[PDB]
Each structure stands twice: as C-alpha cells, then as structure tokens.
From a paper:
Macrophage-expressed gene 1 (MPEG1, also termed Perforin-2) is one of the most ancient and highly conserved members of the membrane attack complex (MAC)/perforin-like (PF)/cholesterol-dependent cytolysin (MACPF/CDC) superfamily, with orthologous sequences identifiable throughout the metazoan. In contrast to other perforin-like proteins characterised to date, human MPEG1 is an integral type-1 transmembrane protein. The mature protein is comprised of three regions; an ectodomain located in the vesicular lumen, a transmembrane domain anchor that spans the vesicular membrane and, finally, a short cytosolic sequence. Each monomer of the 16-subunit ring possesses an N-terminal MACPF/CDC domain, a central multi-vesicular body of 12 kDa (MVB12)-associated β-prism (MABP) domain and a C-terminal region (termed the L-domain).
We therefore expressed the human MPEG1 ectodomain in order to investigate its function. Electron microscopy experiments revealed that the majority of recombinant material eluted as a stable multimeric complex. Accordingly, an integrative single particle cryo-EM approach was used to elucidate the structure of this assembly. Our initial efforts yielded a 3.5 Å structure of wild-type MPEG1. These data revealed that MPEG1 formed hexadecameric rings stacked together to form a double ring (or head-to-head assembly). Although this structure was incomplete, particularly in the C-terminal region, these data provided a platform for directed mutagenesis.
Residue numbers in the entry:
A (entry chain P), B (entry chain O), C (entry chain N): 11 to 389, 399 to 419, 430 to 449, 458 to 526, 536 to 629
Write the structure that this text describes.
Amino acid sequence: EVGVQKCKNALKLPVLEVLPGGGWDNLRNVDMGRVMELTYSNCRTTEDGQYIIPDEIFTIPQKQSNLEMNSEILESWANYQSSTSYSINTELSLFSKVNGKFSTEFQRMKTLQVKDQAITTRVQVRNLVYTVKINPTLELSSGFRKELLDISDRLENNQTRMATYLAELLVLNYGTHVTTSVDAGAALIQEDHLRASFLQDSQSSRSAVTASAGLAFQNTVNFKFEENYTSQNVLTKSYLSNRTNSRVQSIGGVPFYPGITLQAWQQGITNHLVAIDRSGLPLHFFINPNMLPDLPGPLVKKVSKTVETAVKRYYTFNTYPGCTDLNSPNFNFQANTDDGSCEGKMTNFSFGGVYQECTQLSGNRDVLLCQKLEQKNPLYSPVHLLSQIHEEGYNHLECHTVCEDVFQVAKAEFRAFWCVSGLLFGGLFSSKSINPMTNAQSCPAGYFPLRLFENLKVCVSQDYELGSRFAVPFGGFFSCTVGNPLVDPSLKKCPGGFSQHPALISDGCQVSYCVKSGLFTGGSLPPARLPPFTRPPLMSQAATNTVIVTNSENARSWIKDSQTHQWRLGEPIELRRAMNVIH
Amino acid sequence: EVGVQKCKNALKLPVLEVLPGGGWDNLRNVDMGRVMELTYSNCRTTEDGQYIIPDEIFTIPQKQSNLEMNSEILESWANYQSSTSYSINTELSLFSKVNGKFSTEFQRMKTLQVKDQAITTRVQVRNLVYTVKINPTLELSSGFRKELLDISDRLENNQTRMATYLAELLVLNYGTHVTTSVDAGAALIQEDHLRASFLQDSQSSRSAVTASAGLAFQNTVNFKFEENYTSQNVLTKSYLSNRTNSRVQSIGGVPFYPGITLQAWQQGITNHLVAIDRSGLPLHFFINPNMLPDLPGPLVKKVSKTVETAVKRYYTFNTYPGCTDLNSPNFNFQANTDDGSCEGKMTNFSFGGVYQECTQLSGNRDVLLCQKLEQKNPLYSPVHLLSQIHEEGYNHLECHTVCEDVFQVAKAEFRAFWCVSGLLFGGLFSSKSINPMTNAQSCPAGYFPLRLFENLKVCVSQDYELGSRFAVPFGGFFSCTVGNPLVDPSLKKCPGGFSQHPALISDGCQVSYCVKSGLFTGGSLPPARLPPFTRPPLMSQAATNTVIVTNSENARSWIKDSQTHQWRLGEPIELRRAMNVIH
Amino acid sequence: EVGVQKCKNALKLPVLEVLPGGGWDNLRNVDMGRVMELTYSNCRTTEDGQYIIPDEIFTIPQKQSNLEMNSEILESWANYQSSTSYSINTELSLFSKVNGKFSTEFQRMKTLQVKDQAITTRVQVRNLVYTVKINPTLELSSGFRKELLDISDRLENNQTRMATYLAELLVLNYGTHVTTSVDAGAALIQEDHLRASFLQDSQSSRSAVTASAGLAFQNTVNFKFEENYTSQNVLTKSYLSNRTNSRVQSIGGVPFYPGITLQAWQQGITNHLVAIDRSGLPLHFFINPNMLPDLPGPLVKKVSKTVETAVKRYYTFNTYPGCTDLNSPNFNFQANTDDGSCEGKMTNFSFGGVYQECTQLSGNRDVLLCQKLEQKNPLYSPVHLLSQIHEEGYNHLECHTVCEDVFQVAKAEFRAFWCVSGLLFGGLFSSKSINPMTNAQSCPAGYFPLRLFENLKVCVSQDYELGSRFAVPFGGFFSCTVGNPLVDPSLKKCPGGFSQHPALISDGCQVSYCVKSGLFTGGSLPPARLPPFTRPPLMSQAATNTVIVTNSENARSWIKDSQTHQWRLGEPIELRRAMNVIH
Ligand SMILES: *[C@@H]1O[C@H](CO)[C@@H](O[C@@H]2O[C@H](CO)[C@@H](O)[C@H](O)[C@H]2NC(C)=O)[C@H](O)[C@H]1NC(C)=O
Ligand SMILES: *[C@@H]1O[C@H](CO)[C@@H](O[C@@H]2O[C@H](CO)[C@@H](O)[C@H](O)[C@H]2NC(C)=O)[C@H](O)[C@H]1NC(C)=O
Ligand SMILES: *[C@@H]1O[C@H](CO)[C@@H](O[C@@H]2O[C@H](CO)[C@@H](O)[C@H](O)[C@H]2NC(C)=O)[C@H](O)[C@H]1NC(C)=O
Ligand SMILES: *[C@@H]1O[C@H](CO)[C@@H](O[C@@H]2O[C@H](CO)[C@@H](O)[C@H](O)[C@H]2NC(C)=O)[C@H](O)[C@H]1NC(C)=O
Ligand SMILES: *[C@@H]1O[C@H](CO)[C@@H](O[C@@H]2O[C@H](CO)[C@@H](O)[C@H](O)[C@H]2NC(C)=O)[C@H](O)[C@H]1NC(C)=O
Ligand SMILES: *[C@@H]1O[C@H](CO)[C@@H](O[C@@H]2O[C@H](CO)[C@@H](O)[C@H](O)[C@H]2NC(C)=O)[C@H](O)[C@H]1NC(C)=O
C-alpha cells in the first residue's frame, strides 16, 4: 500500500530495472550495495508512459540502434575495451591500467591469446534505449549512512586500527565507485580468436578478413544451424581454419539461439533491458559536509580521508609488475602491469641463509610466544627488512563456586633477517599460497622448511648433488619501506631477468621476493585479493571521550550535548563555560 | 495468513527458489542448514514483477546467454574446475588444493582418467539470469543462534571437551562456509573422455578436435536419435573411436532428451532456475560482537576461535599426501595432494615387534581395564609414539526395597611401542577400516593379529617360508607430534618409495604408518570423514559458575544478573560491590 | 480439519511423498518405522508452489537430468554399488562389507554371476529433482519415544535380560539407521549379464562393448518391440549371443513398456517421485540428553549403550566368513566375507564322539529336566566348549472349591563335550536348519542322531562299509569364547580347506563347526536372521525401586517424586533429607 506497490496498482506498469546509485567494484566489473536512497512517492513515469521510475531520477530517450558490418581487430590485451563498462574503466586515475583486469570477460581473453598466440575480433549489434541519471540533490541510503557514523565514532574515541578495519569493510560491501548514469539497452556480440599468423600475410586484405567476420555473424543469426550459408566463397575456407575459438553472447532481451531473425530478436527487447554502459565517480567523493549534515565539518573530512586510504590500498595490492612482451623471454604470465624488466640479463647471487629472533616484551607470564617466533641459521651481510610486533590475548580465571575471568594481551616483537658455500632455494608457501615447485604446500625432496615471517615456510636444502633438480636462483627480498640493494649495484623492484611475487601482507605492508624459475610464472590467473587486509584488533585501546570539536582558523566549535543527542554548533557563551570544566 | 502465503495470495507470483544465506560444505560441494534469517514481511518482488524475494535480498538482472562452439580440453585432474561451484572453491586459503575433491562430480572424473588413461573435454550452454545477494545488515537464524549460545555456556562453566564436541556438531550441520551470493540460471553440459594418445599426434590440429566436439554436441541436441547428423566427414570417425565415455547433463530448466530444439530448451527455463555459480565467506567470519549483541565482547571471540579450530581440523583430516604422477611408478590412487614422493628409491627396514603396556591409575575397583590394554612381544630400539589416557564409567547399586546408583569413572593410561630375525608385516585393519590384503577384516593365512592402539589389529607372522606371499615391507609409524626418524637418516612423512595411510584418529590426533604394497593403494576412492572426530565426554568435569567477565585493558566488565537473565555491562559502582563478595 | 487435510483443502496441492526421518535397515535395504515426528501446522509448500511439505523440512531444487551413452562394467560382486542406497551403504563402519548384502537386488546379482560365470553391465537415465533434508532441531515421534522409556524402566528396576530383549525389538521395528536426507527422482535402468569370456578377448575394444550396450538400450526404449533397430551391424551379433540375462526396470514415473519415447517417459515423472538415493546416521546417535529431556543424564547414556549392543549383535550374526575366489576350489557360496581360507590344504581329523551331561540344580520336584539334557557316547581328549544354564517354569495348583496356583522356575545347567576307531560324521540339523546331506531334517541311511546342545541332532554312524557314502570329514567346534586348537597346531576359525557353518545361537553366543563337504556349501542364499536372538525371560528377577539417581563427579542428583510423576533435579536440601531415610 506504500512504496512501489501503491504506484504499481494505480498505473499497472512495470518498473524500470536499470537504476543508478549503487556501488561498483572497478577491478572486477561487478556492482554491489546501494549508496543512494530511492523512493517511489510521487508515482513518476517515464514520459513514454511505459515504465515507473523513482522520484530523484530523470531519463533521456535515445532510441538508437547501431548495426556494424565489420569486425574490429584488437590484437593486444594491454589496451582492453570492455563493451559494458568502458566509460567507467577509462577514467583519469592513477590505476587506469588496473581497472577491469580482474573480471570474468578479461581473464578469459588474456588466457585465449597467450595459450594460442591469437588475436581477437568482435562484431556487435548494440541498440541503446534510455539514459538514466541521478539528480545532483540526493540523499544517502539508510544502511550506508549508519556505517559512516560508525567510522566517525571510532575516530573520536581515539580508536585507530578499528576505524581502519571498518573502512575496509566498507570497500568490501560497496565497492570503489558509485554509478551516476547508466544506459538501458540490449547488445548481441560475437567474439572470435584467429591465429596471429593469419593477419600478417593479409596486411593489404585486412579489410577482407573483417568483412567476412561480419558476414559470418549474420549467417549465424539469420540461418538455422543447418548450412544454408552464403559466405563460403574464397576466404571463408581459411577463416574457418585459422580460428581457434568462437562464442556468441546476448546481454539483454530474449536468449539467443542459432537461427532467429534479427527482426525477432529486436522485438523482445521491450521489458528486458540491462545496463550496457555506465559511468560514475569515486566513493569518497560522496563523503562531504553536504551529504552528512549531522556531523561536524572537519570530522567528515577525516572519515573521507580514511575511506580514500582503504580504496588506494586495494589498488596497491592486486598490482603485479613484470614483463609483458609475449615473444620475448622472461615472460611473466601473472603480470598485469609492465615494468621494463624484459630483455634484461641475469646475474646469480648467493644467499647464506635466513634467521629470525624474537623479543617477548610484555607477555612473560602464562604465554611463551618467543619460541616459535625464533628461527636460527641451518649453517655475507644481514639486513633487517621488517620490524613487526605480534600481539596475543589470553585468559586467567580467578575462582573464589563463583569465578571471574580477565583478558590480558601479550606482545612479542620479532625480527627477520637474510644474508646478502650457500643454502639452496626451493620455493615458498604460505597460509594463502602454495609452492609452485610441487603445486602443493610442501618443499621438494631433500628440502626442509624454516619459518621466516611467522606464517610462511622457506624451502631450503644444504646439498649440491640431490637437490639440484628443484633449485632455482634467488634475487632478493624487499618491502614497502626498504628496497633491495641488489638492483642498482635503493629501488623497490627486482634486478633484471628476475620476477617478483607477493608474500605475507602484514598490516598494510607487503614484502616481496625475486626469483627466476619459469615455473612460478605460469599456471592460472590469480583472483582478486579482497579486503580486509588486516585481522580485527583486540580492543586494547581505551576509549577517550571527546565532547567539543573545534578548528582554530574560522573560530567554529561543535559541542556534543548530553545523552548522545547530536553535534550542535557551539554558541560563544556555552563553550566559554565548557572549557573551564575541561581545562 | 502470515509469511509467504500472505504475499503469495495478494500478488499471485512464484517465489524465487535460489537464495543465499545457507551453509555450504566445501570438501563435498553440498549445501546444508540456513545460517541467516529470511523474512517475507514487506512483500517485495523482483523488479521484473515476476518473483517474490525476501526483505534483505537484492537481485541484479543479468539476462546473459553464452553459447560456445568449441570444447575445452582439461588434461589433468589436479587443477579442477567445477562448473557450478568454481567461484567458491578457488578462494585464497591454506586448503585450496583440497576444496571440492570429495564431491560426486570430481570422484567420477578422477576415476575415468586413471582407469582409462584419458583426457576430458566439456562444452556448455550456460544462460545466467539473475545475481542474488544479501544485504550487509543481516540477522542470524533462530536455530543457528541457539547453538552458538550452547557453546558459550560450556566455555563459561569450564567445560572444555564438551564445547569442543558441540563445535564439531556445528560443522556437521552447517558446513564450512556461508554463501553470500548465488547465480540463478540453467546450464547444459556434455563431457567426453578421449584417449590420451589421440591428442598427442594432433598437436597442430588440436583446434580440429575441439571443433568437432562442439559440432557433435549440437547434432545431439537438435537431431532426434536417428542418424541425421552432419558431422561424419573426416575426423568424426576416429573421434567416435578414440572416445571412452560420454554423458549429457542439464542443470536447470526442463529435462533433456536427445532431439529437442535449443529453441525449446531455452523457453522452459522460466520458473525452473537453480544456482549455477556461488561465492561466500567462512563460517567463523559471521561470529563477531556485531551479530551477537547479548554476549560479552571477549566471549564471542572465544566461541569463534573454537569453531575455527573445528573447521581446520576437518581439512587436516581428509588430506592424503602421496605420489600423483600417473606414468611414474609408486603411483598412489587415494592421494589427493602431491608430496614429491615420486621417483624415490626404497630401502628395506626390519622391525622387531610391537608391544603395549597399561597403567590402571584410578579404577582399581570393579573394573579391570589393564588386561586388554596390554600386548606383549611375540618374540633394535623402541619408541613411545603416544601417551593416551582411556576413561570408562561404571555403575554401583547400593540397596537399602529402595536403592540408589552412583556413577564413577575409571582411568587407565596406555603406552604403545614399536621396535626401530624380525616379525613380518601382513597389514592392518581397524574399527573403521579393512585389511586390503584380504579385502576383509582378517589377517591372511599364517598371520595372527595383536592389538596396538586399543582398536586395531596388527597382522604379523613369524615364519619365512609360508607367510612370504602376503608379506609387504614396512616404513615406520609417526603421529601428529612425533615424526619417524627413518626419513632424514625429524619430519612427519614417509621415506622414499613408501606411502602413508591413516589409522586410529584418537582425540584430535591421528597416527600414520608407511608401507610399500601397491595393493593398499588401489581400489575405490575413500569418502569424506565427517565430524565429530571424538566420542562424547562423560560429563566428568564440574561446572564452575562465572558471574562477572572482564578484560584488563579497556576496563570493561560484564555482570550477569540473577535468574540467568542476560549479560549487562557492569557500572563501576556495582562491580565495586560484587568483587568483595567474590574476593 | 487438522493436519494435512486443512492445508490440502486451502492450497489444493499434492503432498511430497519422499520424506526423511524414518528408520532404515542396512543389511536388507528396506525402510521401517518413523523415528522423527512430522507435523503439518504452518501449511508450508515447496517454493515452486507445487508440493506440501512438513514444517521441519527444507527442500533444495536440483532439477538435474543425467543421460549416459555407455554401460559400466562391474565384474566382481564383492564391491557392490546399489543405485538406490549407495550413499548410505558406503558409510565408514566396521561392517561396510556386510551392508546391503541381504537385499533383493544383491542376491539376484550374486546368483546370476556364480551360476553362469558372468559379468554385469548397467546403463541408466537418472533424473534427480529435489533434495529433502531435516532440520537439526527436531522432535522424536510419539511411538518411538514410548519405547525408549520402557527400556529405561527395565534398566532402573535391575531387570537386565528384559531390557536386552526390548532393545532387540527396537531394531526389528525401526532398523539400524535413520535417513536424514533423501533424493526425489525417477531412474530407468537396464542390466545385462554377459559371458565372462566375451570380455577377455575384447580387452582393447572394451569401449566397443559398452558403446553397443548403451546403443541397444535406446533402441529398446524408443522402438516398439518389432525389429526396427539400428544397432545390428558388426558386434551386435555376438553381444546378443554372449549374453545370459537382461531386464529393464523403472523406479519412478509411469511404468515402462518397450516402445515409449524418452520424451514421453520424462513427462510422467511429475507427481510420481521416489527416493533414488539417501544417506543417514546410526540409530543410537539420536539417543542423547538433548532429545530426551525428561530422563536423567547418565540414564539415557545407558539406554543408548544397550541399543548400540543390539545393533552390533545383528551385524555379528548374518556374517559368513569363507572363500570367495570363484575359480579356486573350496569355493563357499554362502560366504559374504572373505577369509583367506582359499588355496589351503586339508588334513583329516578323527573325533571319538560327543557326550553331554546335566546337573539339575534347583528344580528337583515335579520336573525332571536332567534326562533329556544328557547324552552319552555311543562308543583323545574332551573339551567343554560351553557352560549353559536351562531354566523352565511349572505350575502347582493348591486347592482348598477355591484354589490358587503358584509359578516356580526349574534350573538345570548342562555341559556338552566333544573328543579331540572313530565315529563317522553325517551332518547336523536343528530347529532352524536342515541337513544338506538329505535336504531334509533327517540323518542318512545307517546314521543315528544324538542331541548335543538341547536343540540339534548329530548324524553319526559307527560302521566302515555302508555309511561311507554320506561320510564327510570334520574340522572342529568352537564358540564365541573358545576357539578350536586345531587351527594353529587359539584362533576362532576353521583350519585350511574347511568351511564354518552356524549352529545353535544360545543367548547372545553362537557356536560354529568346521566341515569339508561341498554339499553343505551350495544351494540357495540364506535369508537374514532377524532379532530377537533370545526367547523372552520368565520375569524371575524382582523389581528393585530406584528413587534417587546421582553421579559422583559433578554433584548432580535427580530425585524421582511420588506418584511416578517424572525425574526432577535434586536441590541440595531435599536430597539431604532423602538419603537419611535411604541410608
Ligand atoms: C591516541 O592514540 C594514539 C595512537 O596509538 C596514541 O599514540 C601512541 O601512544 C602510545 C602509548 O603511550 C605511545 O607509545 C606511542 O608512541 C604513541 N604514538 C604516537 C604516534 O603518538 C596516543 O597516545 C593516544 N592518546 C590518548 C590520550 O590515549
Ligand atoms: C592459417 O593461415 C595460413 C595463412 O597465413 C594458411 O596458409 C595458406 O593456406 C592456403 C590454403 O589452401 C594455401 O593455399 C596457402 O599456400 C597457405 N600459405 C600462405 C602463405 O598463404 C593456413 O592454411 C591456415 N591454417 C589452416 C589450418 O588452414
Ligand atoms: C578448568 O579446566 C581445566 C581443564 O581441565 C583444568 O585444568 C586441569 O586441571 C586438572 C585438575 O587438577 C590438572 O590436573 C591439570 O593439570 C589442569 N590442566 C591445565 C592445563 O591447567 C582446571 O583445573 C579447571 N579449573 C577449575 C577451577 O576447575
Ligand atoms: C585412436 O587414435 C589413433 C590416432 O592416434 C588412431 O590411429 C589412426 O587410425 C587411423 C584410422 O584409419 C589410421 O588411418 C592411422 O594410420 C592411425 N594412426 C595414426 C598414427 O594416425 C586409432 O585408430 C584410434 N583408435 C581407434 C579404435 O580407431
Ligand atoms: C541386580 O541384578 C544383577 C544381575 O543378575 C544381580 O547380580 C547377580 O545376582 C545373583 C544373585 O545373588 C548372583 O548370584 C550373581 O553372582 C550376580 N552377578 C553379578 C555379575 O553381580 C544383582 O544381585 C542384582 N541386585 C539386586 C539388589 O537385586
Ligand atoms: C561368445 O563370445 C566368443 C568371443 O570370445 C564368440 O566366439 C567368436 O564368435 C565369432 C562369431 O562368428 C567367430 O567369428 C570367432 O571366431 C569366435 N572366436 C573368437 C576367439 O573370436 C562366441 O561365438 C560367442 N558365443 C556365441 C554363442 O556366439
């Protein structure tokens, strides 16, 4: 009787199913959450008189219908068009070469080009109908507003590392962007994968290749699967023979089956409309004093700085520099960002060994952390590489039968070294990784592991006749703070010929290691690594109540009242009586 | 008149049958339980106006329809795609090489490749319709909330080994994950199994193999079973002759029969939608102070640590290291995880014998446990391998005719040894296993059993002329704490050439034994070993009442009131009056 | 107006006919009883809107449809797949090699392979629809709860041997398992039995055998019985000639007749759904203090130990060790469990004779049991083999015409011996068996019987010229406590070349005897031996009232009130006043 169903009973019209305002992940092109609030109170319609739209939504009739007769050749996977999220992946940002490179449509296309030495062609029937946009005066959703107040409460009780944790659960549930405009329509695409040596002789008749690819697309749709085709004349005999893959997907409308008139596909697009393009803005753009009137001024500029840090950390991880030229050697298959590390010679290095010590600062009673946090050399110059503090909580139970239990914490800082007539290297495996020497979390035969950063193992053998089959050279560790001195004989990268691999993200700082195997390189493409990148804190910090919030340079002060009402602006006679009881 | 039927009478629409929130087992890809609460109070619909969804559920219209013209070749069973649970099996975890390897679809495919020396190809018509997700603000179910309170009660009455037992009945009923997003659709798959020598000559024309496999798939669906096929031209005469198996399964929609137009299959998918992909999060992720507001803070971080231990124990069991290379010798067929134990030479070892002693600490009256817990040598250096305590309860009946009965317990610790001109080895069989020398729970001819770990038998014969037909060599025992010293002449694995086998899980610690038979290896694939891995306790521990719960480092205290009301936060004037009567 | 018919009048929908919660016998794959309570109060439906389900039941839509084009060859009957109860027969148990080996489908398949030297192939169209499961919070049925209280009453009046008898009537009525999940669907199977020498020459073209077997299956279903087949080309001329049997069974849906389109069979599966797979848990798993809140704690752990003993006794009986290799001699046809007793030489033994004595302890008046309980030698070293006490009740009638009758009992312990120039052996026959020398309960010509264990006869003749046609050698008696000393010249088995046979189960202990005939071996397969394995007791034990039940180690006590109300927990001030009047 309220909301949609009140409008839907009076009008008896469908609701438009393609709406802006939701969140958007831009590494994996998926949408998530609902940032903006959508209400159906005025019973608005599209001025066709055909759909029902919310109140803060205006549509623009496009009624456009493209129809292409030539496929387009896109040879490299580095410059990637998306066909559904092209306007939002190509924004001007620092990470424009990482957007969209963890999606379903991209990971298939990179696989089919590398494993077959192939080039791809697509041809398309696109058919845009509306453009749906949001008004500039707009209200946040009920569930998204409550999660911004919780980050503000943790920042005003001096609880960092809990506000940081709640900011990374905001990226996980709402993405990195907000879509401000969509495009309702229905596409129909065919992608083929031709052998790359079929293009190189037909450099003059490249226009004859793509003319037959768009010719075969309209035989596939118009003719039923039995061969009544009109394309097999001259070069639709090697086009069929140099191709390595073919698929046809429809995105809106009715489902596609071979042999359906393009007349009949285009008459089922009504009431089956999806978003075939979209654009938007980053997520921290919508955190400003205009959208949040209840909080003070400089407090929402501190929440918006926390969310901006969590989004940029999510792009800093899931970024793999390496070599990208396919015909060159040292080709890294997991790399999504070029480095210039191609055509670079190598030089062998000898590492003496790794060792690890612990400190055991506070928790001397009832918990002994400083036995597994220590690792000594099985057999140069060591480097420190990390200063990491490990905290653990335990439980007493004082009984008196009534009892009580108290929770302490136990700190133990550890230090992990490596030496710059030497131990061999057999790979690494962690609690989120495997060793690709064995395709399993095990060192090979003869090798023995030893812990280095409290979560991963270091496959090492001291021999020179039996473990020489799995021995791969080593290039050096570095971190987010200290680069290795092996490059520039500093910078944070591998030397030439080597490739880096992530290992052991530890509280907003990952360390890396350089190898030269060729076996760590290949395999399947890695998935995206989702936030939170930190385990939850133990609530060890005490809450410090803040009552008055001020800034010095325009003489504005916000006084929180009793009862936790709200933040009102401080009149200059009440803050005069509130600072004496404070100071 | 409430719930679904109120919405279903007014709207007269079906309910969407593919919903998130339920549990999920990730070794065997099955779903179980319902972790999240789903309510039908606002009578929401999918904005098509076609289905009825719960209140805390938002759908995303995809309306996508893939159609592939080439089969894909996947040669090895080690890297396994699932086609229905691929997004959730490939999560970043320690046990990513064990997920999905106890399911129906996997165990068939490993069988058909090993027993035939075959490779598999699949081709598919996939047709995704919606994406159904859960809101981040969400309530636990009524039945799952009550089983988390019962683990908290056992932890606050100092009843360990009962809270551990109730945590393993939570994994049995709700799985190891919670699905947070599903994909409603309907697939149609054909899998074939070609002979592996048919690929190796057609290395150049591998693209001609897969083009005919996708050609035969569309003759099978479009043509009725009588041969009107258009594929038998050149190489659809050995493709039919090198194949070893073939099946066609449909997953959603109407049932498949040979000869049905793809037009007609795709028009029955409405109202018959199933989950063709899903993703989720682990089960202990959803146990936090946000979801459980009634319990104290550090108490739900102790329940969530108990459930995390029970899940990781379920992956530690059902893990079989061994050799995996098929053409190599020493191939272990039961192994699902590689070891590097391939291409390793063997060395014979002589074991003197096993013997077992008992202690009989407490139950000296009315129960004699220390006669069957003892086993002496029928005929080096012994090792201890285990220190296990065996508890049994009995019953007095004091009569006075009125009577009364009291229940005691009887402890008897046992020790089981083995010696590092020697007894022969004929296999083992237990209360959950058989001896594969006989395919039965019996020692062979000439062999006599003797107990070793209070539940299994050790087939042994002292002769050298008659029991030499069933004698297999022996490689050594080890446990979850002590590895054998026979490897590295320590580590917890077999020496080279040998294979390990589980025997006698005893209270969260299994022991293993290394053999070299070739007969223990083969057979059928083992099923998953389900929790609980411990028999129920005898309630021997006394309940210790806890009233006040505190942590030291933010000065928060929770005071349980009378009547067992609930846990309220302790004001600093009531805990001042509650600690004096306590201490 | 209540229950099903209230929901069935409002909704006008059928009820789903495949439900969990019932019992299950696992030797004979049949279902029996109803352990869990099923109520129809909320009028729930399957979210199709198609069936009506109970309240504590959730279904999972599968909508899957397999279709196989190759038969599968299963050569041996030892590893047996069931096609309807495969998930529940393959549980991890001690008796996994006995599950399902007394069913209708197994006993036919073992018969057709032994009597014809044949191998079996099956091909199948499987079509799974739903998966129906039970919630973890669940209530026992009304009739099953009342039979668990009756076992508890006999255990608390010190009436053993009546609680043991009532526990074996619980296995008879409710089976050994409870099904927790079923699979609604409809299969369609063809089984053939080919001659075993037809496989051995087609080792390379085994893939051509199974391709024609799945080809003949789809000619049988699609074509009417007149020969319009498309299979008779090359090897569908000896496949028809090497086969020894053929049947086609349907399990759900409409009945099968030759010539029906697979289109038409798959459209009758709606409203005709049966269980095509199931899984479950043992019966004593569901006897715990959670399911039975009224009884005390350690009392339901004593009922659950009694039922576990009665189930394991039912698997200990119906287990026949013997030789299993078919081409080897000494092949035992009744044996369902291997022994290693194949390829073993024999040695003749001479037994002097059997004799039997009685004691007549108590019933000296009015009943003379010690004349038929005695048997003396008709003509070494004797062994005792059994100490069994025989009790009989009689009736006085004291008259005074008014009268009264009193019932006593008469005990008479008997002892049965056999001697380790000798009596010949002609077989045995009992009150539940026959002599297979005559296929009747009679000794052969010249032989005379003599009683040994108060119920069976021992066919014996002292001659050496006339009873030499029916004389078979003898291998020795043993029991559940004492093995024979003839093996290991101890163990409880036959010597080599001999086979054991059951005789005279007497109060939870059977004795066995070893022969070497070849005529006792063959015949028909024995049926399952159902509980109770003990005649009912004579109520000779006096009832001892128990009022207070306690355990020592958590200081909990349960005080039964007056009137036989119930068992309430004892407060520490009432048991203080209840133990003084007790002790
Ligand atoms: C507010 O929080 C910050 C962040 O932890 C505190 O700063 C640290 O406090 C510890 C405790 O003495 C010091 O050892 C560190 O050196 C401090 N670090 C920095 C960068 O200042 C701060 O003390 C807290 N303030 C209050 C009043 O609790
Ligand atoms: C892949 O493409 C090449 C073209 O670069 C094909 O090679 C030509 O095939 C035609 C077919 O008759 C010949 O007449 C030409 O002589 C070939 N060479 C050149 C340089 O044009 C090749 O055949 C294609 N692959 C397949 C499998 O057909
Ligand atoms: C709480 O439970 C723990 C777990 O059993 C008890 O700890 C053990 O108690 C026994 C009894 O004296 C000792 O023999 C063990 O050495 C203890 N083990 C450990 C690791 O502490 C503990 O005593 C219980 N506390 C109370 C008050 O009952
Ligand atoms: C399995 O595949 C092999 C190909 O590796 C087939 O062998 C070829 O069969 C064709 C059939 O006429 C012959 O012309 C070739 O000479 C064979 N050899 C090669 C190297 O191509 C084999 O026939 C297939 N199996 C069956 C049963 O047909
Ligand atoms: C409770 O029942 C048991 C089981 O029969 C009784 O135990 C036997 O009692 C007879 C009668 O004196 C003795 O001859 C046996 O030696 C007893 N056997 C055992 C194993 O104890 C027991 O006496 C009964 N108790 C009462 C109070 O009636
Ligand atoms: C049972 O199978 C055997 C195959 O092992 C058949 O023997 C063959 O029959 C064909 C029929 O013409 C002959 O051409 C072959 O020479 C036979 N022998 C071999 C070794 O292949 C046998 O005929 C089958 N039984 C029946 C009754 O047909």
